[PDB]
Design a protein around this ligand. Structure first.
Ligand SMILES: Nc1nc(=O)c2nc(Sc3ccc(Cl)cc3)n([C@@H]3O[C@@H]4COP(=O)(O)O[C@H]4[C@H]3O)c2[nH]1
Ligand code: NA
Length: 131
C-alpha cells in the first residue's frame, strides 16, 4: 500500500497552505508530516483543558473549535482550518491556560513536545506571536 506516502504528501501540502509553516525547510516540513498524528473530535469534546499539564501542539485540518477560560466560562475566540493552538504550555510553565473545545466534527494534526521543540519550537510566528 501507498496510503502513508499519499497522506504524507497531503500533510505537507496542508502545512504549506498555512503561512506560519511556510518558512520551514522542505526537510523540516517532511519530518513534521512524519510525526504528527491525525486526531478526531466531535462537538463538545475538550481537546485541551485549562489547568492541565500540556505537552502537545495542535493544527486544525477540519472543523472549528472554541477557546474559553474560567471566570461561567469566558469565551475568547473560535478557530478553524489552518489555525493552531497549544503552544503556550510548551514554553516555560507547562500549564494549559485555556480550554479548547470542538464545536463540530474536528480533525487536528497533533505533535508532541519533543517534535515541536526539535522542528518548530523557534518560529517567531509560533513562539513570539502577540494575542
Ligand atoms: N490563554 C489564552 N488566551 C487566548 O486568548 C487564547 N486564544 C487561543 S487560540 C490562538 C492560538 C494562537 C494564536 Cl497566534 C492566537 C490564538 N489560545 C490558545 O488556547 C490554548 C490553550 O492551551 P495553551 O497551551 O495554554 O496555549 C493556548 C493558546 O494556544 C489562547 N490561550
Ligand atoms: Na508556558
Amino acid at each position: 500500500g501507498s496510503t502513508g506516502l499519499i497522506k504524507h504528501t497531503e500533510y505537507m501540502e496542508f502545512l504549506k497552505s498555512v503561512p506560519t509553516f511556510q518558512s520551514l525547510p522542505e526537510e523540516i516540513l517532511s519530518k513534521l508530516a512524519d510525526v504528527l498524528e491525525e486526531t478526531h473530535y466531535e462537538n463538545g469534546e475538550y481537546i485541551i483543558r485549562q489547568g492541565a499539564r500540556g505537552d502537545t501542539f495542535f493544527i486544525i485540518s477540519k472543523g472549528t473549535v472554541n477557546v474559553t477560560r474560567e471566570d461561567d466560562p469566558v469565551f475568547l475566540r473560535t478557530l478553524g482550518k489552518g489555525d493552531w493552538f497549544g503552544e503556550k504550555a510548551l514554553q516555560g510553565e507547562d500549564v494549559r491556560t485555556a480550554n479548547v473545545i470542538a464545536a463540530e466534527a474536528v480533525t487536528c494534526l497533533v505533535i508532541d513536545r519533543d517534535s515541536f521543540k526539535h522542528l518548530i519550537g523557534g518560529l517567531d510566528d509560533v513562539s513570539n506571536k502577540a494575542y
